[PDB]
Amino acid sequence: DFPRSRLRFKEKLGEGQFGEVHLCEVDSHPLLVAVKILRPDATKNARNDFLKEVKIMSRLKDPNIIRLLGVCVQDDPLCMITDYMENGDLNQFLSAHQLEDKPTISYPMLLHVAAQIASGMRYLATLNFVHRDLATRNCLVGENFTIKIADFGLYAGDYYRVQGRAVLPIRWMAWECILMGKFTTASDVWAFGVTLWEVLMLCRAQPFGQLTDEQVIENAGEFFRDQGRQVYLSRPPACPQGLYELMLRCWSRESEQRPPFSQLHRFLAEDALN
Numbered sequence: 318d319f320p321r322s323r324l325r326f327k328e329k330l331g332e333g334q335f336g337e338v339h340l341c342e343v344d345s346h347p348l349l350v351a352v353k354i355l356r357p358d359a360t361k362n363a364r365n366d367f368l369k370e371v372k373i374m375s376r377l378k379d380p381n382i383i384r385l386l387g388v389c390v391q392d393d394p395l396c397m398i399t400d401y402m403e404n405g406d407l408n409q410f411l412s413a414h415q416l417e418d419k420p421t422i423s424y425p426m427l428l429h430v431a432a433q434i435a436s437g438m439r440y441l442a443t444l445n446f447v448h449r450d451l452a453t454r455n456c457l458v459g460e461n462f463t464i465k466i467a468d469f470g471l472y473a474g475d476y477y478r479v480q481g482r483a484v485l486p487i488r489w490m491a492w493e494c495i496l497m498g499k500f501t502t503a504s505d506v507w508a509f510g511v512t513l514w515e516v517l518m519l520c521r522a523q524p525f526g527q528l529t530d531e532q533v534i535e536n537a538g539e540f541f542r543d544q545g546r547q548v549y550l551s552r553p554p555a556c557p558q559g560l561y562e563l564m565l566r567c568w569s570r571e572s573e574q575r576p577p578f579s580q581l582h583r584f585l586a587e588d589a590l591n
């Protein structure tokens with residue numbers, strides 16, 4: 318596990334903080350995989366983060382979570398190998414589709430997309446694993462509208478950057494994450510609510526897109542104060558009222574009032590059809 322010389326590099330797919338992903342072919346006719354390797358400018362800190370991500374990823378084994386197929390971590394150079402998800406991230410994919418009138422996507426397909434994210438998150442919750450950056454940009458799309466959640470690191474405007482602070486996806490963040498940096502399964506539910514809003518919007522608009530970062534942060538202060546001045550994402554045109562109410566439960570002020578992923582999954586697979 319795994320002979321590096323079996324890998325044939327084809328195209329660079331993307332790039333993050335301590336790694337670079339490439340499309341590769343495996344001889345082992347044409348098997349495609351995604352391969353993450355260190356960036357050319359990698360430091361010893363990047364090598365350490367890459368080894369950790371290997372450890373984190375090795376534990377995740379579910380149909381709707383990206384799966385580690387293999388590793389080069391013994392003799393150099395370091396590599397991580399996953400399924401190649403041929404349709405890219407879900408944000409770009411939904412951006413290229415329009416909702417069916419009466420490349421298109423049906424409303425029941427939007428539900429099926431959301432249900433797969435909810436099942437993936439259901440699995441993470443059983444492991445008490447907190448994702449901290451659930452969004453359509455961190456979901457990958459395979460064949461037959463198969464969704465795998467990644468942890469994935471472009472979408473610069475989706476993160477609030479202050480020097481010397483962690484980079485924060487504030488528009489997906491529960492009011493208590495913004496005010497206190499506390500991330501829990503309950504805050505992943507709130508982000509799931511925002512992710513479901515993105516799916517039903519077909520990624521046509523940034524969440525709170527007409528509000529500044531500072532207004533989004535002061536809106537978290539309004540959830541805290543609980544004086545009826547907090548503001549929510551509006552109902553997407555493709556979204557019925559019943560499904561909108563489910564998004565609103567994800568954005569309950571009280572963390573314990575937010576539905577668990579098992580309930581969100583049931584609703585989107587079953588109740589949402591009626």
Ligand SMILES: Cc1nc(Nc2ncc(C(=O)Nc3c(C)cccc3Cl)s2)cc(N2CCN(CCO)CC2)n1
Pocket residue numbers: 330331338351352353383397398399400401402403404405406457467468469
């Ligand atoms: C950014 C991107 N990724 C794609 N597929 C991937 N599969 C798996 C990926 C991945 O990163 N694995 C991974 C690894 C290896 C280690 C740790 C963690 C992880 Cl999650 S990335 C396809 C794609 N394209 C598809 C075709 N589009 C046509 C548009 O018109 C263009 C864009 N673009």
